[PDB]
Amino acid sequence: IKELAVDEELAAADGLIPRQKSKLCKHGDRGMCEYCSPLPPWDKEYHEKNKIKHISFHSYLKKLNENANISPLSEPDFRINKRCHNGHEPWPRGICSKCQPSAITLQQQEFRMVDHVEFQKSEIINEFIQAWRYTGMQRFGYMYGSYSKYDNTPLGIKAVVEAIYEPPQHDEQDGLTMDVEQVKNEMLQIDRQAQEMGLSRIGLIFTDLSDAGAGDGSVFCKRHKDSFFLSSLEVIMAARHQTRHPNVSKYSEQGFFSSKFVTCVISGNLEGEIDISSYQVSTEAEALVTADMISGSTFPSMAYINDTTDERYVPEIFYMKSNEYGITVKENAKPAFPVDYLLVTLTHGFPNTDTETNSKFVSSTGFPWSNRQAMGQSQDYQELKKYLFNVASSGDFNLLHEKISNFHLLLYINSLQILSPDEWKLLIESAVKNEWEESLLKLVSSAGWQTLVMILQESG
Ligand SMILES: [Zn+2]
Ligand SMILES: [Zn+2]
């Protein structure tokens, strides 16, 4: 199929980085030579100098293309061919040079598919965190939004988060669980509706928050260099999500390469403050997990390597173990290795207030988010009436716009199946269009809307 607009745009950018004249330059200020010519966007020293921890995907792709001047990209695959009949019976009855997996060497991935996670409004994050503040129990959510150019790294991409949807879940003081099938079925419906709003499911976010007992609002720092950043189970979760949300690329043999799906953790920083850390996992991680080669066990920082079975062939596995200077040495990754090596890190932030606001939803709060009944925040007629009824008859379109421009409000209204599909589209336009007044005028006049407001009137 086609690539995202952001990938098409960045393919058409050259990412050149002009340089000052060098000492060694034997020419004028406007001349050029090997010492002062523009750097390519993937230039390692530039990234090191500027403390950019990974090069961007398009810097990486342009680097591969230059060095190969065959699809430059290919998703790694560590699975044994269980149907090789090249002069033997297939695994586990036989093996040959064509089907036998060779030794795997793991290392920190030098590029990242997404460079930055931008939350459109701090209220989005703060209302998610409120689930934990209110209950003392952890929380999981899916992030909706889109991808755009990020100019603070060469050819960078940012995930732009517009909303968070929390799936049904069983939260506890020190973790949480989900019914995988239940969540999948629900997210299928939410994905479809979010798509009608111009949103994609672009990542996941979860808390690891524990009050530090100082009456400060301060929290413990659990995740740091001497413990772990993401646990092996979390890395496996992230890999599975990435593989299920593949990034389309015409430059890969398979038509896809890795994923733009991002993983965020809200937890204490070293100063005891609530902060966000953002990650993806490497394509090596994707392939390890697809081949069912790693598991979580005793120590959360370590990825445990699984055994060879009838279904799974596990070759020798090495990793490029780093010292404090960043110098690596090849070591045996078995029986377990630090899962750190499977991560890439992303920056995160919020738009500045005077940046041109292109936020999809005017309000992030005010109407209960989904799956918060146990928090005392139900989505009912009583709640919708309280939220919306008086404004809906005031003639105040500014306030009405503010009320309906709200992701969780929209999903709840659509679930009532009062509005027609045309009226539903009208309501979406009223919520997310820059010029929304004409749409809202149509909606308010529609039979479906009138029906809804009347239903609100009679309830209570
Ligand atoms: Zn020069
Ligand atoms: Zn074979």
Would you put residue 35 in left (φ > 0), alpha (ψ -120 to 50) or beta? alpha
Instruction: For helices 407-416 and 180-196, give the axis angle rounded to 10 degrees.
Output: 100
- Cα of 205 to ligand 1 centre, how many Å? 47
Residue 458 CA to chain centroid, in angstroms?
A: 43
78 CA to centre of ligand 2 in angstroms? 15
Q: Looking at the CA of 22, name the nearest ligand.
A: 1
Cβ-based neighbours of 107, under 8 Å, separated by 6 or more: 284, 319, 320, 328, 341
In the reported structure, the alpha carbon of residue 106 is separated from the centroid of ligand 1 by a whole-number distance in angstroms of 39
CA distance 424 to 404: 12
Task: Looking at the CA of 81, name the nearest ligand.
Answer: 2
CA distances from 368 to 216, 378, 411 (A): 27, 6, 11
Residue 104 phi, psi dihedral angles, 5° rounding: -105, 130
Ligand at minimal distance from the CA of 18 is 1
Ligand lying closest to the C-alpha of residue 28 = 1
**What HEC string does the chain produce?**
CCCCHHHHHHHCCCCCECCCCCCCCCCCCCCCCCCCCCECCCCHHHHHHCCCCCEEHHHHHHHHHHHCCCCCECCCCCCCCCCCCCCCCCCCCCCCCCCCCCCEEECCCCEECCCEEEECCHHHHHHHHHHHHHHCCCCEEEEEEEEEEECCCCCEEEEEEEEEECCCCEEECCEEECCHHHHHHHHHHHHHHHHHCCCEEEEEEEEECCECCCCCCCECCCCCCCCCCCCHHHHHHHHHHHHHCEEECCCECCCEEEECCEEEEEEECCCCCEEEEEEEECHHHHHHHHCCCEEECCCCCEEEECCCCCCCCCCCEEEEEECCCCCEEEEECCCEEEHHHHEEEEEEECCCCCCCCCCCCCCCCCCCCCCCHHHCCCCCHHHHHHHHHHHHCCCCHHHHHHHHCCHHHHHHHHHHCCCCHHHHHHHHHHHHCCCCHHHHHHHHHCHHHHHHHHHHHHCC
The alpha carbon of 97 and the centre of ligand 2 are apart by a number of angstroms equal to: 6
**454 touches 418 (CB < 8 A):** no
What's the rounded Cα separation, in Å, for the pair 187 and 82? 33
d(CA 358, CA 371) in angstroms, rounded, equals 27
Closest residue by Cα to residue 340 from 299, 390, 392, 383: 299
The whole-angstrom separation of Cα 370 and Cα 42 is: 42
| Count, residues in the chain | 460
Span between the terminal Cα atoms of the chain, in Å: 50
**Whether the bond into 300 is cis, omega within 30 of 0:** no
Q: 106 and 333 in contact (C-beta within 8 Å)?
A: yes
Instruction: For strands 55-56 and 328-332, give the pairing.
Output: unpaired
User: How many whole angstroms from 155 Cα to the centroid of ligand 1?
Assistant: 25
Ligand nearest to the CA of 93: 2
Residue with tokens 């079925």: 185
Q: How far is the CA of 17 from the centre of ligand 1 (A)?
A: 14
The tokens 């100082």 sit on which residue?
214
In Å, what resolution does this model reach? 1.7
**262-268 and 274-281: which strand pairing?**
antiparallel
Contacts of 446 (CB under 8 A, 6+ apart): 419, 420, 423, 426
Task: Say if CB 201 and CB 124 are below 8 A apart.
Answer: no
CB atoms within 10 A of CB 437: 12
**Ligand 2 midpoint to CA 251 (Å):** 29
CA of 152 to the centre of ligand 2 (A): 48
Q: Are strands 336-338 and 302-305 parallel, antiparallel or unpaired?
A: antiparallel
User: What distances in angstroms separate CA 231 from CA 265, 300, 352, 380, one per listed residue?
Assistant: 11, 5, 32, 38
Identify whether the C-beta of residue 426 lies closer than 8 Å to the C-beta of residue 442.
Answer: yes
Tell me, in angstroms, the distance from the centre of ligand 1 to residue 401's CA. 58
Q: Residues within 5 Å of ion ligand 2 by Cβ?
A: 84, 86, 96, 98-99
**Ligand nearest 29 Cα, by number?**
1
Sign for the pseudo-dihedral over CA of 186, 191, 192, 193: positive
List the structure tokens of 190: 């939410």
Q: How far is the CA of 290 from the centre of ligand 2 (A)?
A: 20
**Cα of 42 to ligand 1 centre, how many Å?**
20
**Cα(256)–Cα(87) distance, rounded to whole angstroms?**
33
CA–centroid distance, 59 to ligand 1, in Å, is 24
193 with 414: CB under 8 angstroms? yes
CA–centroid distance, residue 54 to ligand 1 (Å):
28
Buried b (16+ CB within 10 A) or exposed e, 49-63: eeebebbbbbbbbbb
The residues with which 207 forms a beta bridge, in sequence order, are 266
Name the amino acid, one letter, at 439. Answer: S
Alpha carbons 58 and 8: distance in angstroms, whole number: 10
Is 174 exposed, middle or buried, given 0-12, 13-18 or 19+ CB atoms closer than 10 A?
exposed
CA distances from 253 to 56, 78, 101, 349 (A): 20, 16, 20, 34
Query: Which residues in the chain have their C atom more than 2.5 Å from the N of the next written residue, marking a break after them?
Result: 69
Is-contact 283 258, C-beta < 8 A? yes
Q: CB within 5 A of ion ligand 1: which residues?
A: 25, 33, 35-36
Interval between CA 315 and ligand 2 midpoint (Å): 15
Structural method: X-ray
Which numbered ligand comes closest to the C-alpha of 313? 2
Say if domain 1-352 classifies as CATH 3.40.140.10: yes
Largest pairwise CA distance in the chain: 85
Ligand 2 centroid–CA 9 distance in Å is 43
Order the strands of the 104-106 sheet from edge to edge.
104-106, 317-322, 328-332
Tokens 């299920």 appear where?
A: 244
- Residues contacting 256, CB < 8 A, separation 6+: 75, 246, 247, 248, 249
CA angle 92, 283, 301 (to 5 degrees): 90
| Cα angle 8, 290, 244; round to 5 | 45
Ligand nearest to the CA of 19: 1
Domain ranges of the chain: 1-352, 373-458
Question: What is the CA(23)–ligand 1 centre distance, in A?
Answer: 8
Instruction: Tokens for 222, please give them.
Output: 């659990």
Q: How far is the CA of 79 from the centre of ligand 2 (A)?
A: 13
- Ligand at minimal distance from the CA of 26 is 1
**How many Å lie between the centroid of ligand 1 and the Cα of residue 21?**
5
Ligand 1 centre distance from Cα of residue 39 (Å): 12
Q: Find out whether 253 and 201 touch, Cβ atoms under 8 Å.
A: no
User: Residue for token digits 């200077």?
Assistant: 325
How far, in Å, CA of 166 to CA of 289, rounded? 25
